[PDB]
Write an enzyme that holds these catalytic residues in place. Structure first.
Site, PDB file in Angstrom:
ATOM      1  CG  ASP A  83      -4.386  10.684 -54.816  1.00 32.75           C
ATOM      2  OD1 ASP A  83      -4.809  11.646 -55.710  1.00 32.75           O
ATOM      3  OD2 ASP A  83      -3.927   9.500 -55.166  1.00 32.75           O
ATOM      4  NE  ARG A 108       1.466   4.673 -52.038  1.00 32.06           N
ATOM      5  CZ  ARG A 108       1.738   5.634 -52.589  1.00 32.06           C
ATOM      6  NH1 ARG A 108       1.508   6.726 -51.817  1.00 32.06           N
ATOM      7  NH2 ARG A 108       2.571   5.859 -53.643  1.00 32.06           N
ATOM      8  CG  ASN A 109      -4.085   8.215 -51.454  1.00 34.34           C
ATOM      9  OD1 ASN A 109      -2.934   7.977 -51.992  1.00 34.34           O
ATOM     10  ND2 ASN A 109      -5.501   7.785 -51.452  1.00 34.34           N
ATOM     11  CG  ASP A 155      -8.177   7.570 -53.295  1.00 27.36           C
ATOM     12  OD1 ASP A 155      -8.458   6.492 -52.579  1.00 27.36           O
ATOM     13  OD2 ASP A 155      -7.403   7.452 -54.142  1.00 27.36           O
TER      14      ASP A 155
HETATM   15  C1  LIG Z   1     -12.624  15.634 -59.724  1.00 28.93           C
HETATM   16  N1  LIG Z   1     -11.269  16.716 -59.936  1.00 28.93           N
HETATM   17  C2  LIG Z   1     -10.911  16.624 -61.012  1.00 28.93           C
HETATM   18  C3  LIG Z   1      -9.702  17.775 -61.119  1.00 28.93           C
HETATM   19  N2  LIG Z   1      -8.867  17.291 -60.005  1.00 28.93           N
HETATM   20  C4  LIG Z   1      -7.497  18.197 -59.911  1.00 28.93           C
HETATM   21  C5  LIG Z   1      -6.393  17.546 -58.946  1.00 28.93           C
HETATM   22  C6  LIG Z   1      -5.953  16.249 -59.069  1.00 28.93           C
HETATM   23  C7  LIG Z   1      -5.018  15.794 -58.292  1.00 28.93           C
HETATM   24  C8  LIG Z   1      -4.447  16.637 -57.368  1.00 28.93           C
HETATM   25  C9  LIG Z   1      -3.288  15.982 -56.514  1.00 28.93           C
HETATM   26  C10 LIG Z   1      -3.176  16.597 -55.158  1.00 28.93           C
HETATM   27  C11 LIG Z   1      -2.386  16.100 -54.504  1.00 28.93           C
HETATM   28  C12 LIG Z   1      -1.444  15.115 -54.802  1.00 28.93           C
HETATM   29  C13 LIG Z   1      -0.458  14.327 -53.978  1.00 28.93           C
HETATM   30  O1  LIG Z   1      -0.583  12.936 -53.511  1.00 28.93           O
HETATM   31  C14 LIG Z   1       0.295  12.207 -52.867  1.00 28.93           C
HETATM   32  C15 LIG Z   1      -0.198  11.075 -52.358  1.00 28.93           C
HETATM   33  C16 LIG Z   1      -0.335   9.940 -53.155  1.00 28.93           C
HETATM   34  C17 LIG Z   1       0.548  10.004 -54.398  1.00 28.93           C
HETATM   35  C18 LIG Z   1       0.933  11.569 -54.004  1.00 28.93           C
HETATM   36  N3  LIG Z   1       2.652  11.799 -53.594  1.00 28.93           N
HETATM   37  C19 LIG Z   1       3.200  12.919 -53.581  1.00 28.93           C
HETATM   38  O2  LIG Z   1       2.855  13.972 -53.935  1.00 28.93           O
HETATM   39  C20 LIG Z   1       4.694  12.943 -53.008  1.00 28.93           C
HETATM   40  C21 LIG Z   1       5.307  11.714 -53.223  1.00 28.93           C
HETATM   41  C22 LIG Z   1       6.571  11.774 -52.625  1.00 28.93           C
HETATM   42  C23 LIG Z   1       7.594  10.772 -52.352  1.00 28.93           C
HETATM   43  C24 LIG Z   1       8.773  10.393 -51.293  1.00 28.93           C
HETATM   44  N4  LIG Z   1       9.203   9.252 -51.561  1.00 28.93           N
HETATM   45  N5  LIG Z   1       8.397   8.583 -52.099  1.00 28.93           N
HETATM   46  C25 LIG Z   1       8.658   7.218 -52.594  1.00 28.93           C
HETATM   47  C26 LIG Z   1       7.426   9.365 -52.681  1.00 28.93           C
HETATM   48  C27 LIG Z   1       7.172  13.160 -51.967  1.00 28.93           C
HETATM   49  N6  LIG Z   1       6.434  14.157 -52.018  1.00 28.93           N
HETATM   50  C28 LIG Z   1       5.320  14.139 -52.517  1.00 28.93           C
HETATM   51  N7  LIG Z   1       4.474  15.466 -52.639  1.00 28.93           N
HETATM   52  C29 LIG Z   1      -1.935  14.334 -55.992  1.00 28.93           C
HETATM   53  C30 LIG Z   1      -2.982  15.164 -56.927  1.00 28.93           C
HETATM   54  C31 LIG Z   1      -4.949  18.032 -57.076  1.00 28.93           C
HETATM   55  C32 LIG Z   1      -5.979  18.712 -58.164  1.00 28.93           C
HETATM   56  C33 LIG Z   1      -9.357  17.314 -58.618  1.00 28.93           C
HETATM   57  C34 LIG Z   1     -10.463  16.336 -58.696  1.00 28.93           C
HETATM   58 CL   LIG Z   2       3.852   8.712 -52.618  1.00 30.06          CL
END
Ligand SMILES: CN1CCN(Cc2ccc(-c3ccc(CO[C@H]4CCC[C@@H]4NC(=O)c4cc(-c5cnn(C)c5)cnc4N)cc3)cc2)CC1
Ligand SMILES: [Cl-]
Ligand SMILES: [Cl-]
Ligand SMILES: [Cl-]
Ligand SMILES: [Cl-]
Ligand SMILES: [Cl-]
Ligand SMILES: [Cl-]
Length: 290
Positions: free
Chosen positions: A168, A154-155, A150
């Site tokens: 992400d 955006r990620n 992904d």
């Molecule tokens: C198949 N397996 C199954 C098992 N899974 C386990 C698993 C699943 C998911 C993750 C995981 C790891 C990292 C993220 C972070 O991702 C970011 C990009 C997108 C959203 C998100 N954003 C933020 O985290 C964020 C936003 C903001 C912010 C500021 N201003 N505004 C408006 C927002 C400030 N700080 C931040 N840190 C997500 C999921 C880890 C492990 C593995 C696969």
């Molecule tokens: Cl975000």
């Protein structure tokens, strides 16, 4: 149960604040995490919108998260842990706890930069450093046999020091590992970033990530345009089968565009590796003024 216990954070240590973003596959919230020292840490909290989507037990989710907690690289976000929240039907709902990245995601940042109140107009060289940053993060992950799955602007997140990190990991997995999700979670993959071979078949390799990186480079060079203006999502596979690719953005160096389009060769084996891309981009960035 050593790395599996260690990854889990007690739910009581966490206070949820406002929703920052909400989509079909989950939400991101601000939170505060009480520390051992009595202090609170500002964190982001990613929830997953899980409704019978998984074909493994929650332990699997945790062991994948534990592996990701070991990531140690400036261009890869490092998760802090996972909290579990039980549903009324007794189903565990995991919450990934991340350090709070004040500037948010790279895509939105690029768009804000095109407004007077936003970030200032981003110079070509800074755009190019963003691309190197992402290449370095993907090189690290691909060296550990991870598939991102992904990869889009955006990620990618912006640190306080304007370092981009890859984030992400919701669809990320080791090559050769099983699926955690059923057939429903490929729907999160945005079509205009999916390599031609992955649209043809449920097939995804590190070279499919390279394709998505090239699309991400293009998003950065256009300061946040949607890929393939004039082309609808359901037309994409045919469009790509006919050999059409993303067009060169205005003011994009020819050298840079060559690097991007090497990512979209029809045969995955003709695409470069992240090490090669990264070196090509570092060289290009070096060849320009300060
Ligand atoms: C198949 N397996 C199954 C098992 N899974 C386990 C698993 C699943 C998911 C993750 C995981 C790891 C990292 C993220 C972070 O991702 C970011 C990009 C997108 C959203 C998100 N954003 C933020 O985290 C964020 C936003 C903001 C912010 C500021 N201003 N505004 C408006 C927002 C400030 N700080 C931040 N840190 C997500 C999921 C880890 C492990 C593995 C696969
Ligand atoms: Cl975000
Ligand atoms: Cl709470
Ligand atoms: Cl981090
Ligand atoms: Cl736009
Ligand atoms: Cl295009
Ligand atoms: Cl063109």
């Amino acid at each position: 149960q050593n790395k599996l216990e260690d990854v889990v954070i007690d739910r009581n240590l966490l206070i949820l604040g406002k929703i920052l973003g909400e989509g079909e596959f989950g939400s991101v919230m601000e939170g505060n995490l009480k520390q051992e020292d009595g202090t609170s840490l500002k964190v982001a909290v990613k929830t997953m919108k899980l409704d019978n989507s998984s074909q493994r037990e929650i332990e699997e989710f945790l062991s994948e998260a534990a592996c990701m907690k070991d990531f140690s690289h400036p261009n890869v976000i490092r998760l802090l842990g996972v909290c579990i929240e039980m549903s009324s039907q007794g189903i565990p709902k995991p919450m990934v706890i991340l350090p709070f990245m004040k500037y948010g995601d790279l895509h939105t940042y690029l768009l804000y930069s095109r407004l007077e109140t936003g970030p200032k107009h981003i110079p070509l060289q800074t755009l190019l450093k963003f691309m190197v940053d992402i290449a370095l993060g993907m090189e690290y992950l691909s060296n550990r046999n991870f598939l991102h799955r992904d990869l889009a602007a955006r990620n990618c997140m912006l640190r306080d020091d304007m370092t981009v990190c890859v984030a992400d990991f919701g669809l990320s997995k080791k090559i050769y590992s099983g699926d955690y999700y059923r057939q429903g979670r490929i729907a999160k993959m945005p079509v205009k970033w999916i390599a031609i071979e992955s649209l043809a078949d449920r097939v995804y390799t590190s070279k499919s990530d390279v394709w998505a990186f090239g699309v991400t480079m293009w998003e950065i060079a256009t300061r946040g345009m949607t890929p393939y203006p004039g082309v609808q999502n359901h037309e994409m596979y045919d469009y790509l089968l006919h050999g059409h690719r993303l067009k060169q953005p205005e003011d994009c160096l020819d050298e840079l565009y060559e690097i991007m389009y090497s990512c979209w060769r029809t045969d995955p084996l003709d695409r470069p590796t992240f090490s090669v891309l990264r070196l090509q981009l570092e060289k290009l960035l070096e060849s320009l003024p300060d």
